[PDB]
Amino acid sequence: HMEAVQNRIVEAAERVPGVRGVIHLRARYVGQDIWADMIIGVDPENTVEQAHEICEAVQAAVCGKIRRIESLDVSAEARE
């Protein structure tokens, strides 16, 4: 069900260089498709540009691995 998909999303995101955990993930079904919004932790000393790059890389990785996701927004917050 949903929990299995959420596990996969978290595991996929964590394997992306520069992710320091998944801080938040909201996933919902729109029909058979998942729409999700996520916040990742990142090094506080990364630049804003780097954090944007990490978010883009997470979006690509997660959407590539979990084919039912049809919308994924990823934002970042500083995390030790």
Q: How far is the CB of 13 from a second copy (least distance, A)?
A: 15
State which residue, 4 or 30, has the beta carbon closest to a second copy: 4
Residue 19: CB atoms within 10 A of its CB come to 23
Q: Report helix, strand or coil for 19.
A: coil
Residue 58: CB atoms within 10 A of its CB come to 26
Binding mask 2-31 for a second copy (x = CB under 8 A): --x--x------------------------
Give the footprint of a second copy on this chain (CB under 8 A): 4, 7, 67-68
